[PDB]
Every structure is written in structure tokens, then in C-alpha cells.
């Protein structure tokens, strides 16, 4: 089996990306943050704390033929960005882009934090990361992922995030026609429970290529790209007038700057990502300060290829025996 569905910025810059989930019977259309960061299907429902839904789209799982509830199972999930919501857990059918699993954990949201609120374009997350990370207890639950590998044509999935575009997830086949050259693969580490790999290195704008290891994480979830302090440095000094805002919270950037091309290696080969694409636009509205996209790592305590790197490659997830990434230009 497959499954193809289409990925769709929530705004004009990109800040995040929602993808149309159907959930139920009959189904129930929620638009999830496909999250390879994280490992937990949750969604707004009918359970939601009322004053904490504002505009999302709800499950309601008493409507779903399908729909049990998990007997004493709760989840209660903090991500890294501060946000965080809990709730209890229903089983039932899930289904992305024609590819469908039955008995699938869904996490009902009970309590969400002001940052989901706020988002009325994201009805919920859906983890791709490891399912060791998952946060149901006592039972832990399997990802939707690791739920449909045994079915899928083959065991993998592949990012391929728009620049203001829509781009698109695939399960269980790799579309040649949906990227250029060659997809370069490279080692993973599932220790922590991330697509954790080793970057080969960097370059800035039109600049020498700067061969180091730069271990981090393949994550749709996160925004930006978060990368080592010196790296980061690298990078803004090239753009006139950057600077690191404490008041602000990263970089920002004169908004009258052209942004240079970053650029990141995979083994031998190289992703670059557009200097349009580090343009987060003005830091409140109005300003002619604006907000850069690639941010230090420092104080996280991992690096992240989040969308801002993610969107300029076509990514493989390849969920065989032993995982790995895989990675092409576009
Ligand atoms: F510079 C940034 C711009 C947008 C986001 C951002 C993250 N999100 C996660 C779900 N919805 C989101 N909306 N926005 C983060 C940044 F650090
Ligand atoms: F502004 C931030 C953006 C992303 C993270 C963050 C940490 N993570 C650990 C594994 N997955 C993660 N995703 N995100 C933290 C931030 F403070």
C-alpha cells in the first residue's frame, strides 16, 4: 500500500505545515502538523477544554462508529518550543492521503496550551518520529508511521515541503520524478528517538565549503534551522546590519537585506537552501526589522534541520531495520 498527501504552509511564511487527516467513521477531517520530532497523534476534540478551542477543527470521537477509548491510557506532551498539551487516548481508524490504519492511538486533547489556541489552522500533530518517544501511559502507543510499515510498499516516507508552496508527504514509495540528481543517504541514530544524523558540514552564501560534523535532528515540526552558535555567526555576518536580539529572541536582520544562500552537506553531497528562505518577515508588524530563520542551537542542547533546510531537499525517511535519511535537491 501508499499514501500521498499534499502539505499546505498555515501562512505566508511558512510557520509551520498542516496536511488533511482523515479520522473515524465516517471520517473526520483534521488538518495535523506532521511532526518528525515527535512520536504522539493528537488532536483538538470534543473533550477539548472549551476556552482552549478557538477555531480548530474538533474529533469527536462518540460520532465515530470505529472510535474506542483506550481503557486508563493518558499522554501529556511538552515540546521543545514550550508548548504542551495532554489528554486521554482513543483507538481508531486513521487515514493519510488513501493509506489507512485501523486501531491507530489518537490522542484526544483534554488541555492544550495557549500557543495551540492561538494556531486556529492546526487541529493537531501527528508524530513521525520514533515510537519510543511516545507519550501514552501506561501503555505506550506506535506511531502512525510504524503502524502502517508492515503494509507499506516499502517501509518509508518522504518529506517534501514547498517554499510558499504546498509540497507533499509520501508513504511507502519514493517519486523519482519529485526531485533531481541523486538521493544521497547517511546514518541514523535512533538513541534518542529522533532521525538523528550527521551533517558534513556548511557553507555560507557563495562561500568556501567548511567541512565539520554537525550532528542534529531531520524535524518537520520545527520551524526554523537551529545550528551550532559559531555556524550561526558564520552565517548573519555576511548579512549587513544582523545582529542577536536578547529582546527580540534570535537574529534578526534589516529587512531591506538580500540574504545570502546557506548551504549543508549530506556525506558528499550538498542541500542549499535560497536566501529567501531564512526571511521570517518582520519581527512585529510594521517593523523593518525582520526575523532570521536560521537560529543558534545553544540553550537547546540539539541541533535541528527543521522545514527552513527540510523545504529546500526532497527527504527520504527510510523506517527499514536499520533507518536511515536520505536526502536530494529539488
Ligand atoms: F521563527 C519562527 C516562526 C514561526 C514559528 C512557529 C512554530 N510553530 C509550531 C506550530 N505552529 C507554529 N507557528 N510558528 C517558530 C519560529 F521560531
Ligand atoms: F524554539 C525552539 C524550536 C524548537 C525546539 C525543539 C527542541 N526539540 C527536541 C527534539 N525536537 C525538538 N523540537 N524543537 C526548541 C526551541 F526552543
Same mark, same amino acid.
Do not use: M
Given at each position: 500500500?501508499?499514501?500521498?498527501?499534499?502539505?499546505?504552509?498555515?501562512?505566508?511564511?511558512?510557520?509551520?505545515?498542516?496536511?488533511?487527516?482523515?479520522?473515524?467513521?465516517?471520517?473526520?477531517?483534521?488538518?495535523?502538523?506532521?511532526?518528525?520530532?515527535?512520536?504522539?497523534?493528537?488532536?483538538?476534540?470534543?473533550?477539548?477544554?472549551?476556552?482552549?478551542?478557538?477555531?480548530?477543527?474538533?474529533?469527536?470521537?462518540?460520532?465515530?462508529?470505529?472510535?474506542?477509548?483506550?481503557?486508563?491510557?493518558?499522554?501529556?506532551?511538552?515540546?521543545?518550543?514550550?508548548?504542551?498539551?495532554?489528554?486521554?487516548?482513543?483507538?481508531?481508524?486513521?487515514?493519510?492521503?488513501?493509506?489507512?490504519?485501523?486501531?491507530?492511538?489518537?490522542?484526544?486533547?483534554?488541555?492544550?496550551?495557549?500557543?495551540?489556541?492561538?494556531?486556529?489552522?492546526?487541529?493537531?500533530?501527528?508524530?513521525?518520529?520514533?515510537?519510543?518517544?511516545?507519550?501514552?501511559?501506561?501503555?505506550?502507543?506506535?506511531?502512525?508511521?510504524?503502524?502502517?510499515?508492515?503494509?507499506?510498499?516499502?517501509?518509508?516516507?518522504?518529506?517534501?515541503?514547498?517554499?510558499?508552496?504546498?509540497?507533499?508527504?509520501? #508513504? $511507502?514509495? *519514493?517519486?523519482?520524478? !519529485?526531485?533531481? @540528481?541523486?538521493?544521497?543517504?547517511?546514518? &541514523?541514530?535512533? =538513541?534518542?528517538? %529522533?532521525?538523528?544524523?550527521?551533517?558534513?558540514?556548511?557553507?555560507?552564501?557563495?562561500?568556501?565549503?567548511?567541512?565539520?560534523?554537525?550532528?542534529?535532528?531531520?524535524?518537520?515540526?520545527?520551524?526554523?534551522?537551529?545550528?551550532?552558535?559559531?555556524?550561526?555567526?558564520?552565517?548573519?555576518?555576511?548579512?549587513?546590519?544582523?545582529?542577536?536580539?536578547?529582546?527580540?529572541?534570535?537574529?534578526?536582520?534589516?529587512?531591506?537585506?538580500?540574504?545570502?544562500?546557506?548551504?549543508?552537506?549530506?556525506?558528499?553531497?550538498?542541500?542549499?537552501?535560497?536566501?529567501?528562505?531564512?526571511?521570517?518577515?518582520?519581527?512585529?508588524?510594521?517593523?523593518?526589522?525582520? #526575523? $532570521?530563520? *536560521?537560529?543558534?542551537? !545553544?540553550?537547546? @542542547?540539539?541541533?535541528?534541520?527543521?522545514? &527552513?533546510?527540510? =523545504?529546500?531537499? %526532497?527527504?527520504?525517511?527510510?523506517?527499514?531495520?536499520?533507518?536511515?535519511?536520505?536526502?536530494?535537491?529539488?
Amino acid at each position: 500500500s501508499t499514501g500521498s498527501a499534499t502539505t499546505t504552509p498555515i501562512d505566508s511564511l511558512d510557520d509551520a505545515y498542516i496536511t488533511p487527516v482523515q479520522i473515524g467513521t465516517p471520517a473526520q477531517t483534521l488538518n495535523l502538523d506532521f511532526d518528525t520530532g515527535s512520536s504522539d497523534l493528537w488532536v483538538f476534540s470534543s473533550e477539548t477544554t472549551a476556552s482552549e478551542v478557538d477555531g480548530q477543527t474538533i474529533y469527536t470521537p462518540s460520532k465515530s462508529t470505529t472510535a474506542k477509548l483506550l481503557s486508563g491510557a493518558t499522554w501529556s506532551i511538552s515540546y521543545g518550543d514550550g508548548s504542551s498539551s495532554s489528554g486521554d487516548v482513543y483507538t481508531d481508524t486513521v487515514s493519510v492521503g488513501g493509506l489507512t490504519v485501523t486501531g491507530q492511538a489518537v490522542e484526544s486533547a483534554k488541555k492544550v496550551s495557549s500557543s495551540f489556541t492561538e494556531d486556529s489552522t492546526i487541529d493537531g500533530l501527528l508524530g513521525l518520529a520514533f515510537s519510543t518517544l511516545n507519550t501514552v501511559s501506561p501503555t505506550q502507543q506506535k506511531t502512525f508511521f510504524d503502524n502502517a510499515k508492515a503494509s507499506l510498499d516499502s517501509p518509508v516516507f518522504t518529506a517534501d515541503l514547498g517554499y510558499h508552496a504546498p509540497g507533499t508527504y509520501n #508513504f $511507502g514509495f *519514493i517519486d523519482t520524478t !519529485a526531485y533531481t @540528481g541523486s538521493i544521497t543517504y547517511t546514518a &541514523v541514530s535512533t =538513541k534518542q528517538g %529522533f532521525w538523528e544524523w550527521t551533517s558534513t558540514g556548511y557553507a555560507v552564501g557563495s562561500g568556501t565549503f567548511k567541512s565539520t560534523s554537525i550532528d542534529g535532528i531531520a524535524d518537520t515540526g520545527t520551524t526554523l534551522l537551529y545550528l551550532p552558535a559559531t555556524v550561526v555567526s558564520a552565517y548573519w555576518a555576511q548579512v549587513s546590519g544582523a545582529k542577536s536580539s536578547s529582546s527580540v529572541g534570535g537574529y534578526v536582520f534589516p529587512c531591506s537585506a538580500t540574504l545570502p544562500s546557506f548551504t549543508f552537506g549530506v556525506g558528499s553531497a550538498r542541500i542549499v537552501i535560497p536566501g529567501d528562505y531564512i526571511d521570517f518577515g518582520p519581527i512585529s508588524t510594521g517593523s523593518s526589522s525582520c #526575523f $532570521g530563520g *536560521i537560529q543558534s542551537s !545553544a540553550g537547546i @542542547g540539539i541541533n535541528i534541520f527543521g522545514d &527552513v533546510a527540510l =523545504k529546500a531537499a %526532497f527527504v527520504v525517511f527510510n523506517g527499514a531495520t536499520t533507518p536511515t535519511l536520505g536526502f536530494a535537491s529539488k
